[PDB]
Design a protein around this ligand. Structure first.
Ligand SMILES: CC(C)(CC(=O)O)CC(=O)Nc1cc(Cl)cc(Cl)c1
Length: 133
């Protein structure tokens, strides 16, 4: 019942500073523009200890499955090859990605009827708000 309140199908309803976050990460111009236009759905499910998060949009469909606290390799939507670990910290899903000596952290939180995603790369934070589909 670890992630019950995250499970479901969510649709992006607002974004702030995502282009700048992507710039800070190192994403190139064309990918930033097309990815920034996307209105993804985020589909979260749990089966036993395995959490699956899918992101689907006109730009890209991605899928990760993982066990909390157990590192895995991830190819991101912008084609980084990263080492990822996702944990629960005080009811927040905390996703750390490591590559090329860099690090970014993505937090997913339930707030009211929304799922709020905060993406941090060095001093740059982007906030993406999802609602139930
Ligand atoms: C958690 C997430 C960050 C944001 C969301 O799910 O809303 C997933 C995502 O879109 N990743 C991403 C995509 C591109 Cl193309 C470039 C970079 Cl840096 C990141």
């Amino acid at each position: 019942h670890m992630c019950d309140a995250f499970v479901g199908t969510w649709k992006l309803v607002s974004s702030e500073n995502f282009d700048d976050y992507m710039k800070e990460v190192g994403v190139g111009f064309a990918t930033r523009k097309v990815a920034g236009m996307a209105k993804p759905n985020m589909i979260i499910s749990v089966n036993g200890d395995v959490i699956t998060i899918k992101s689907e949009s006109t730009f890209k469909n991605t899928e990760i499955s993982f066990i909390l606290g157990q590192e895995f390799d991830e190819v991101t939507a912008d084609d980084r090859k990263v080492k990822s670990t996702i944990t629960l910290d005080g009811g927040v899903l905390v996703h750390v990605q490591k590559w090329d000596g860099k690090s970014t952290t993505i937090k997913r939180k339930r707030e009211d009827d929304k799922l709020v995603v905060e993406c941090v790369m060095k001093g740059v934070t982007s906030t993406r708000v999802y609602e139930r589909a």
